[PDB]
CSV table of C-alpha atoms and ligand atoms in Angstrom, one decimal:
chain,number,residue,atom,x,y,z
P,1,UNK,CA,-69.5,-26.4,-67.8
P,2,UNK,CA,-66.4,-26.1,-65.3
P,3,UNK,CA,-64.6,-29.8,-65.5
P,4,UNK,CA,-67.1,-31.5,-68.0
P,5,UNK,CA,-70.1,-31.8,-65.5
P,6,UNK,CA,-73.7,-32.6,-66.7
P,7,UNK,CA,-75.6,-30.0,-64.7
P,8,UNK,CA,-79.2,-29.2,-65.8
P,9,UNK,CA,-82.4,-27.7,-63.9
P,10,UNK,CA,-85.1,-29.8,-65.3
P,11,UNK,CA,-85.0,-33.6,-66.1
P,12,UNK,CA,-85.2,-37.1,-65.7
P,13,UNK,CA,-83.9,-39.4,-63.4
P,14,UNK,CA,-83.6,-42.4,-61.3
P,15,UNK,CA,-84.0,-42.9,-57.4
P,16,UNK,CA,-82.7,-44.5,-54.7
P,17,UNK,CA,-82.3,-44.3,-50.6
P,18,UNK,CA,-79.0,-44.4,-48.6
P,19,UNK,CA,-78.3,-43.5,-44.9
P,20,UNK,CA,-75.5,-41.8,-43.5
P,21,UNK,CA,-75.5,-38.5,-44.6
P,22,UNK,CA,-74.4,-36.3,-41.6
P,23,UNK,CA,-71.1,-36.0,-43.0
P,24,UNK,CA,-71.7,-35.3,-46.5
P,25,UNK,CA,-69.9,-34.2,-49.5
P,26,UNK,CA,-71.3,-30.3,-50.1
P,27,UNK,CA,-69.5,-30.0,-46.1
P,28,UNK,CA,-72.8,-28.9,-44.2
P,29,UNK,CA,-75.7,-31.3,-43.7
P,30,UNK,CA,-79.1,-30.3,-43.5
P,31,UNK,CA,-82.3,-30.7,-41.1
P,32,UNK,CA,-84.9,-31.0,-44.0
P,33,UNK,CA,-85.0,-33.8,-46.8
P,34,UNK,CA,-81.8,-34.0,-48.3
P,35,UNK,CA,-79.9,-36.3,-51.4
P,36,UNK,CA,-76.8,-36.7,-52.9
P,37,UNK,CA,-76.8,-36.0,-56.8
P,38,UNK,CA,-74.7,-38.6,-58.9
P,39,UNK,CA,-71.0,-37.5,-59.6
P,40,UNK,CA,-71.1,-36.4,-63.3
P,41,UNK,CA,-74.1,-33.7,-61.4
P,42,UNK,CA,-72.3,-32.9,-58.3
P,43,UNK,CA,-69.6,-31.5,-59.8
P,44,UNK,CA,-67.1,-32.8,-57.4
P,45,UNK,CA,-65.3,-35.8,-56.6
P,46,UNK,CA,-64.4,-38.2,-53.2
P,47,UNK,CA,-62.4,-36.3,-51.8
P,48,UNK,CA,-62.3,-32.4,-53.3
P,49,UNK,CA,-65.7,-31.0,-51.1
P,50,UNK,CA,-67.9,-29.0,-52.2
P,51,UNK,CA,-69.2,-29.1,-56.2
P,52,UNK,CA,-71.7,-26.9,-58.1
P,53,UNK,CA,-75.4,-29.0,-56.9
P,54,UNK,CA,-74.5,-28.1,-53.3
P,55,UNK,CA,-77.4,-26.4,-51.6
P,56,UNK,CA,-80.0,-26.3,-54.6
P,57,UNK,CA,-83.2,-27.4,-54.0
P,58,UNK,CA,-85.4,-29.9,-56.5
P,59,UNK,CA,-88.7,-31.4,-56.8
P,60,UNK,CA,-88.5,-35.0,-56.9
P,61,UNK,CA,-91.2,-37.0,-58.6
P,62,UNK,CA,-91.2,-40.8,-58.7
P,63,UNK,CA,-93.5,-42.5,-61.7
P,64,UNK,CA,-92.4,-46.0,-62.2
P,65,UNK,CA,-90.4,-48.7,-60.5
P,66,UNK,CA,-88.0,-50.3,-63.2
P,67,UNK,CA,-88.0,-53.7,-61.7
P,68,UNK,CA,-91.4,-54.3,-61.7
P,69,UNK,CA,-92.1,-51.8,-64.7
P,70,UNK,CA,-95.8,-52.8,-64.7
P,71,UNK,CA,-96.5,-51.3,-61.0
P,72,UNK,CA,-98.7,-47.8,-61.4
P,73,UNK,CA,-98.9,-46.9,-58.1
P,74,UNK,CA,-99.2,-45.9,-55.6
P,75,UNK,CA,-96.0,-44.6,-55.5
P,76,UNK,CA,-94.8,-41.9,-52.9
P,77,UNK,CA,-95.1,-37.7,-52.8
P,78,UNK,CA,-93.6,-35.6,-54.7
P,79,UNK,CA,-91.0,-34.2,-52.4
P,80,UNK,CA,-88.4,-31.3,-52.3
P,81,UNK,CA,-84.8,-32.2,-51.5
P,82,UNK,CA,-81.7,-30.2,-50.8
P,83,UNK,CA,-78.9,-31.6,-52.9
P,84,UNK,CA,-76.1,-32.3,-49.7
P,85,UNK,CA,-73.7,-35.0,-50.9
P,86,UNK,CA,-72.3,-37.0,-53.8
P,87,UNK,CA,-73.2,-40.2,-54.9
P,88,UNK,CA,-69.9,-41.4,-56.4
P,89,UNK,CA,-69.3,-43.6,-59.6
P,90,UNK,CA,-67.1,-45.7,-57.7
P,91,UNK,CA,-69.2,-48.8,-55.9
P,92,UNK,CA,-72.6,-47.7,-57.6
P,93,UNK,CA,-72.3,-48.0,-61.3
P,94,UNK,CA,-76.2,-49.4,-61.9
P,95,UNK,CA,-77.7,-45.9,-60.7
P,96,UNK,CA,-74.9,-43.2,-60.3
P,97,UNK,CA,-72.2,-44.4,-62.8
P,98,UNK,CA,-73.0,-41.6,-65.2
P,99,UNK,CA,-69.8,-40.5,-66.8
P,100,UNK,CA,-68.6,-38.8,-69.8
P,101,UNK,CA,-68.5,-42.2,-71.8
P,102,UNK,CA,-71.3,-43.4,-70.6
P,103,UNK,CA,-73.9,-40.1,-69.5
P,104,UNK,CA,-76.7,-42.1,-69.0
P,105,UNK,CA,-77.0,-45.0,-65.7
P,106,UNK,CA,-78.4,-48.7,-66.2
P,107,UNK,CA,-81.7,-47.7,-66.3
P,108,UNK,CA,-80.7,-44.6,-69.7
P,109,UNK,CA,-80.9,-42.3,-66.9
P,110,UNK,CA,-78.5,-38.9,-66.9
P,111,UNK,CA,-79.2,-38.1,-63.3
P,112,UNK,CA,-79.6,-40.3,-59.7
P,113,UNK,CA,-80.7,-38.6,-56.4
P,114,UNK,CA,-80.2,-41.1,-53.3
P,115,UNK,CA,-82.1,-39.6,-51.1
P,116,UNK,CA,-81.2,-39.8,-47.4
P,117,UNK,CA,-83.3,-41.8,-45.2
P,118,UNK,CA,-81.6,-40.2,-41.9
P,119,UNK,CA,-84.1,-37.1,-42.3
P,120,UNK,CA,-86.9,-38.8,-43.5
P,121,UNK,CA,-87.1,-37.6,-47.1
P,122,UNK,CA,-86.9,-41.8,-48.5
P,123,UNK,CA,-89.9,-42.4,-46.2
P,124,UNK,CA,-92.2,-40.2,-47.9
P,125,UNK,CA,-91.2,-40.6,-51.4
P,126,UNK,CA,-91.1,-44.5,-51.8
P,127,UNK,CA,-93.5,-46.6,-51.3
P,128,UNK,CA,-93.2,-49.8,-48.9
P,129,UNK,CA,-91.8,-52.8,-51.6
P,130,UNK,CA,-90.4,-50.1,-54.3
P,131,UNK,CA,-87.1,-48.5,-52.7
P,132,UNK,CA,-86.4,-47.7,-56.5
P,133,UNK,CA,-87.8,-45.5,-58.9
P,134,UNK,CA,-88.0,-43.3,-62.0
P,135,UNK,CA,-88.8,-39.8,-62.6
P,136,UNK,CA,-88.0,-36.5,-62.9
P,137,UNK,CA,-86.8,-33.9,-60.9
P,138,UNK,CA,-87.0,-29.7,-61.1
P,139,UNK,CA,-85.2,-27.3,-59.8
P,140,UNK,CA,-86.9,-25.4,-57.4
P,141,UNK,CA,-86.5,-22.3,-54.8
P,142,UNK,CA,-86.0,-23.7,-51.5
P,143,UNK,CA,-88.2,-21.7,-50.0
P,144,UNK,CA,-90.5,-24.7,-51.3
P,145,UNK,CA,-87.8,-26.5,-48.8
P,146,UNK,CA,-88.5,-27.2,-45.2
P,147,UNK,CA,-85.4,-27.2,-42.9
P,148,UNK,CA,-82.2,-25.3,-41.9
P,149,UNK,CA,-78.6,-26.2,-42.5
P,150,UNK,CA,-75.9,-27.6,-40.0
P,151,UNK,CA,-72.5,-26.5,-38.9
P,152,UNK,CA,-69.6,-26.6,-41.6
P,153,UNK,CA,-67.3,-29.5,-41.1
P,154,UNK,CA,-64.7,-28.5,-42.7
P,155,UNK,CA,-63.0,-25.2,-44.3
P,156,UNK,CA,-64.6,-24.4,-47.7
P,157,UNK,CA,-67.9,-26.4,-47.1
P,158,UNK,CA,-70.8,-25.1,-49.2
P,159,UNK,CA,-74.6,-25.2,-50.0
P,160,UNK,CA,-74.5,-21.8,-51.8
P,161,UNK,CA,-76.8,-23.1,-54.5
P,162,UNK,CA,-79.6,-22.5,-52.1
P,163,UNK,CA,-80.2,-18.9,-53.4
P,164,UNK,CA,-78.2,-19.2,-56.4
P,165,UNK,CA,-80.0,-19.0,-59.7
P,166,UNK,CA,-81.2,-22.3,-61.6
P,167,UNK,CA,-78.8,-24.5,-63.5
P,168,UNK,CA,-76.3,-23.9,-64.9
P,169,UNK,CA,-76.2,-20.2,-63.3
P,170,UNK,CA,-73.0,-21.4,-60.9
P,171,UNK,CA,-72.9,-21.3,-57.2
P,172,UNK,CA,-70.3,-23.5,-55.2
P,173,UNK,CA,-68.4,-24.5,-58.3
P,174,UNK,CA,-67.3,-27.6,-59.6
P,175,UNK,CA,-63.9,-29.1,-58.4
P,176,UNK,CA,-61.6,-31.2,-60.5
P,177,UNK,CA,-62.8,-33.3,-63.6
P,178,UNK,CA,-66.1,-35.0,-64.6
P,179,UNK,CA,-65.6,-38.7,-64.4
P,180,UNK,CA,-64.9,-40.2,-67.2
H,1,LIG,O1,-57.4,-30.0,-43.4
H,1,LIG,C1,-57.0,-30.2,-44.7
H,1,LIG,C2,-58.0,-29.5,-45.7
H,1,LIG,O2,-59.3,-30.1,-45.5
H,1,LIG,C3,-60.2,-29.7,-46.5
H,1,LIG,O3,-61.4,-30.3,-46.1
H,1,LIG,C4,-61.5,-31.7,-46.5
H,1,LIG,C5,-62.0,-32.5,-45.2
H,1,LIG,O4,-60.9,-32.6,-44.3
H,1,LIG,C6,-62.5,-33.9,-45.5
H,1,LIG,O5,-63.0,-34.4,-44.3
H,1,LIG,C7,-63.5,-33.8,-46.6
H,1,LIG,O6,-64.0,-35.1,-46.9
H,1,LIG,C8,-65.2,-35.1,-47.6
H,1,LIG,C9,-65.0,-35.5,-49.0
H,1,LIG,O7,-64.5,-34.4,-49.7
H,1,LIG,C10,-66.4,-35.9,-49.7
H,1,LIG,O8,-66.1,-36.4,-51.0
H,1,LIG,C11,-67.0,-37.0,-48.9
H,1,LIG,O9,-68.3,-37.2,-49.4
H,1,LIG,C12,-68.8,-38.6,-49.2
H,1,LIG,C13,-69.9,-38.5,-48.2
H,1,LIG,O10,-69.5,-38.3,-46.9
H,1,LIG,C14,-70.7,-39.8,-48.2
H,1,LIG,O11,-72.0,-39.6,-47.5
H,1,LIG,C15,-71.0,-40.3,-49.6
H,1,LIG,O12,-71.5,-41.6,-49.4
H,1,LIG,C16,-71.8,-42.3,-50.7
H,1,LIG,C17,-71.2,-43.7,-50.5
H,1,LIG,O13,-69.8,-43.6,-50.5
H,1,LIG,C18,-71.6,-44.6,-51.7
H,1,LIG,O14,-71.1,-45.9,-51.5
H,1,LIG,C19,-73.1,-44.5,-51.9
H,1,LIG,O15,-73.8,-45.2,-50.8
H,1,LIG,O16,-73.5,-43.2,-52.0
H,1,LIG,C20,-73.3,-42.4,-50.8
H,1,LIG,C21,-73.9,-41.0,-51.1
H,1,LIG,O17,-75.2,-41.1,-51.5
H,1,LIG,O18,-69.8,-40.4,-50.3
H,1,LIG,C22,-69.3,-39.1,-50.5
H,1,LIG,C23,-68.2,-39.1,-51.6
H,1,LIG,O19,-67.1,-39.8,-51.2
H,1,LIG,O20,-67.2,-36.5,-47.6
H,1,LIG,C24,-66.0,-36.2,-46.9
H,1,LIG,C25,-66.4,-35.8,-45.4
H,1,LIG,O21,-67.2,-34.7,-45.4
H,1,LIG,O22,-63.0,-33.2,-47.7
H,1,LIG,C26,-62.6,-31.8,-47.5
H,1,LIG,C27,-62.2,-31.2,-48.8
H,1,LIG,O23,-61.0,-31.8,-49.4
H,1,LIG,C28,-60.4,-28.2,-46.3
H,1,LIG,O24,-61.2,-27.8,-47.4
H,1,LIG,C29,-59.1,-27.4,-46.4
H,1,LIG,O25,-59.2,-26.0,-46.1
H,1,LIG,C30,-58.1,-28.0,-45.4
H,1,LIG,O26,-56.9,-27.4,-45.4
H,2,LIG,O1,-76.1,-47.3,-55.3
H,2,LIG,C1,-77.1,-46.4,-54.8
H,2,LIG,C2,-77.7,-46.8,-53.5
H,2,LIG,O2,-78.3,-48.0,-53.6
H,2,LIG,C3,-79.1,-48.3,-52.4
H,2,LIG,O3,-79.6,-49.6,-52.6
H,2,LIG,C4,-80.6,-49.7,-53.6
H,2,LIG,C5,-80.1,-50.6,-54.8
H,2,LIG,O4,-79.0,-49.9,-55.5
H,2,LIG,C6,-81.2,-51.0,-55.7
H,2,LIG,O5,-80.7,-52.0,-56.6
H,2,LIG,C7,-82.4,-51.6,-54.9
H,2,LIG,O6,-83.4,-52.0,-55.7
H,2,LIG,C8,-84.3,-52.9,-55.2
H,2,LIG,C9,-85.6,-52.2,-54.9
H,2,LIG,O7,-85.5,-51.2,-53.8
H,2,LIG,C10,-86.7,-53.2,-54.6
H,2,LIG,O8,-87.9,-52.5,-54.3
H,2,LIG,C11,-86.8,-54.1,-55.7
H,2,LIG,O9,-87.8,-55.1,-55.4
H,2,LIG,C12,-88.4,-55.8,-56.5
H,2,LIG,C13,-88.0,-57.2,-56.4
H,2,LIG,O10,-86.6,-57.5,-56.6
H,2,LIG,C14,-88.8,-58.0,-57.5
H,2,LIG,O11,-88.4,-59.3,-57.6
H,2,LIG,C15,-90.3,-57.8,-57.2
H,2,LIG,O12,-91.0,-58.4,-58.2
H,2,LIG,C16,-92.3,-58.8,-57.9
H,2,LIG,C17,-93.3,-58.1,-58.7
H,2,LIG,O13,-93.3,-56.7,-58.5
H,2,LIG,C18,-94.7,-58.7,-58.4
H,2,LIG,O14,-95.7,-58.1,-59.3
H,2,LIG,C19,-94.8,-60.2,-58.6
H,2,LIG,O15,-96.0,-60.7,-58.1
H,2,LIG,O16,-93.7,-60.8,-57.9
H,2,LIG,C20,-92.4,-60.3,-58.1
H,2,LIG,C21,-91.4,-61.2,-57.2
H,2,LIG,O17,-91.6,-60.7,-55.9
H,2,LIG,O18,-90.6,-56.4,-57.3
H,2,LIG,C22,-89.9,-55.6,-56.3
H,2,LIG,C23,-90.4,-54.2,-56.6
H,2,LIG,O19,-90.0,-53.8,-57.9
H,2,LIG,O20,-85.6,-54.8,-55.9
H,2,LIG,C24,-84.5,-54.0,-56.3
H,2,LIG,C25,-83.3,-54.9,-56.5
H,2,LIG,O21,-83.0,-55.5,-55.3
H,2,LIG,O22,-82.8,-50.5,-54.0
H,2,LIG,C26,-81.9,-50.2,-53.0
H,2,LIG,C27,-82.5,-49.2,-52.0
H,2,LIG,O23,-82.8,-47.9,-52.7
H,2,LIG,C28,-78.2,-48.4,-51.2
H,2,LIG,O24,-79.1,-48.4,-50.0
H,2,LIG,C29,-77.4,-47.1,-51.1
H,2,LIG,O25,-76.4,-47.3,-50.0
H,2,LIG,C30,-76.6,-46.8,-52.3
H,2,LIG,O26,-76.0,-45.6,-52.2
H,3,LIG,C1,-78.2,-35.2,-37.9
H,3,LIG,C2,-78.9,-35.1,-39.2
H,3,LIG,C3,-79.8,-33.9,-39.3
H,3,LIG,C4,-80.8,-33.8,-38.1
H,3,LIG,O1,-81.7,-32.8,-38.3
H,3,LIG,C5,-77.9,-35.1,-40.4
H,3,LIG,C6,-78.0,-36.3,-41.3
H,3,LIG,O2,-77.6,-37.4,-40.5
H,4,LIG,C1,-57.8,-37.5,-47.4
H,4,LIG,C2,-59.3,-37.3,-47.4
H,4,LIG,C3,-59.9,-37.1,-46.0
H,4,LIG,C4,-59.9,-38.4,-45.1
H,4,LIG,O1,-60.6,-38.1,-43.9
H,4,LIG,C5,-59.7,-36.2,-48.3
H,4,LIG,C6,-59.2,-36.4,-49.7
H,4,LIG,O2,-59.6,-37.6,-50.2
H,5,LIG,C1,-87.4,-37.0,-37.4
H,5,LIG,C2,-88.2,-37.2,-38.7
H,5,LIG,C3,-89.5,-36.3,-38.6
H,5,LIG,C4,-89.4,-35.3,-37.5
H,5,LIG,O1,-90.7,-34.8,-37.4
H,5,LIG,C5,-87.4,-36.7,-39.9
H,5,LIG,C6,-86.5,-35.5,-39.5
H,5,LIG,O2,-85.2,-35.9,-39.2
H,6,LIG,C1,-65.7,-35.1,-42.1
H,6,LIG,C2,-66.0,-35.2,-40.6
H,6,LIG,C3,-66.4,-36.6,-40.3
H,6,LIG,C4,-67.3,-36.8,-39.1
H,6,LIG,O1,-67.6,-38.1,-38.9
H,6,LIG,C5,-64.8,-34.7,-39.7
H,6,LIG,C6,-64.5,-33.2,-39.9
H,6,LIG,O2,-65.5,-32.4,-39.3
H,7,LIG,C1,-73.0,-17.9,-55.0
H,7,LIG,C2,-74.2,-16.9,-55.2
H,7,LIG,C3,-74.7,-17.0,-56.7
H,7,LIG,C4,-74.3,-15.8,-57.5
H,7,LIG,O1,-75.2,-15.6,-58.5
H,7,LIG,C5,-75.3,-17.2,-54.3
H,7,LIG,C6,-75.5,-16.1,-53.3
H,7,LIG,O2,-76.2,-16.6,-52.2
């Protein structure tokens, strides 16, 4: 793929919640459940906008908490997130530090979604005393998405891959280099 991103439909991953995503990477926020993807996905870096996972659409499925791996439940729904923002290598090694030396995060993961809690997509999928998961996700239509998406911030903002096709079809496109 464009700049050595890991970009795939259909997979496994780990999960997490942050806040603060009205300003986010893609350049538009969104009213419905929304994550950012970890770097080596996004296809983008701090600064540069807009990378290929803006605007697609994925079914996220939380199965197992990998701190307490003997928990089976209950864990949260099954929810569908547009992919907004980028959760960067830089400050958050143990769950988005996949790069091209190391694809896979602390937990052998190749993908992270931190899901934003500001609209309410964290509250749904994990359950009070687990704010960290396992899983998989899907790409999805997002038509199976509930929401619409804000004003652009900023010249060249995207979330294209909301009717693109699936991975790795291209939609925003990646910017600059996979980290490394
Ligand atoms: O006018 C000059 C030029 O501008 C071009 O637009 C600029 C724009 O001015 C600038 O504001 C914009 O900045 C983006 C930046 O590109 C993007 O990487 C950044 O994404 C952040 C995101 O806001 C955070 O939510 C996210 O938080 C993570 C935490 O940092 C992390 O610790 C962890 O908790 O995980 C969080 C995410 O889960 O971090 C992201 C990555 O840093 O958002 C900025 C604000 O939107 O950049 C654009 C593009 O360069 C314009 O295109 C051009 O035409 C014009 O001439
Ligand atoms: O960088 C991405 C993103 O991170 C967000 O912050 C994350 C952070 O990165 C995670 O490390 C953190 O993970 C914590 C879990 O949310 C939390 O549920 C888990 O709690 C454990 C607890 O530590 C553990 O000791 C406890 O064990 C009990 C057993 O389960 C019981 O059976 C037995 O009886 O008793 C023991 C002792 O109590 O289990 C629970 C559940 O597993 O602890 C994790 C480590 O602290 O999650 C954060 C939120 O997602 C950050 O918000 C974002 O800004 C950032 O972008
Ligand atoms: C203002 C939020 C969307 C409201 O629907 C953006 C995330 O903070
Ligand atoms: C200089 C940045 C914007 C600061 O608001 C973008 C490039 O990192
Ligand atoms: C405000 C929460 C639910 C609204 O019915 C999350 C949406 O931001
Ligand atoms: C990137 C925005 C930050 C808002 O807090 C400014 C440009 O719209
Ligand atoms: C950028 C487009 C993908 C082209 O196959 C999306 C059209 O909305």
């Amino acid at each position: 793929a464009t700049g050595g991103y890991v970009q795939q439909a259909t997979g496994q991953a780990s999960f997490t919640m942050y806040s603060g995503c009205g300003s986010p990477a893609c350049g538009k926020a969104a009213s419905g459940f929304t994550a950012a993807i970890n770097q080596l996905a996004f296809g983008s870096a701090p600064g540069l906008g807009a990378g290929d996972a803006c605007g697609r659409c994925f079914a996220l499925t939380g199965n197992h908490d990998p701190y307490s791996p003997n928990y089976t439940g209950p864990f949260g729904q099954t929810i569908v997130v547009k992919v907004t923002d980028l959760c960067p290598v830089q400050g958050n090694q143990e769950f988005c530090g996949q790069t091209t030396s190391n694809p896979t995060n602390q937990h052998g993961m190749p993908f992270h979604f931190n899901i934003c809690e500001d609209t309410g997509g964290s509250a749904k999928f994990f359950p009070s005393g687990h704010g960290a998961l396992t899983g998989t996700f899907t790409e999805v239509s997002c038509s199976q998405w509930s929401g619409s998406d804000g004003g652009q911030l900023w010249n060249g903002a995207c979330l294209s891959g909301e009717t693109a096709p699936n991975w790795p079809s291209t939609a925003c496109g990646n910017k600059g280099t996979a980290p490394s």
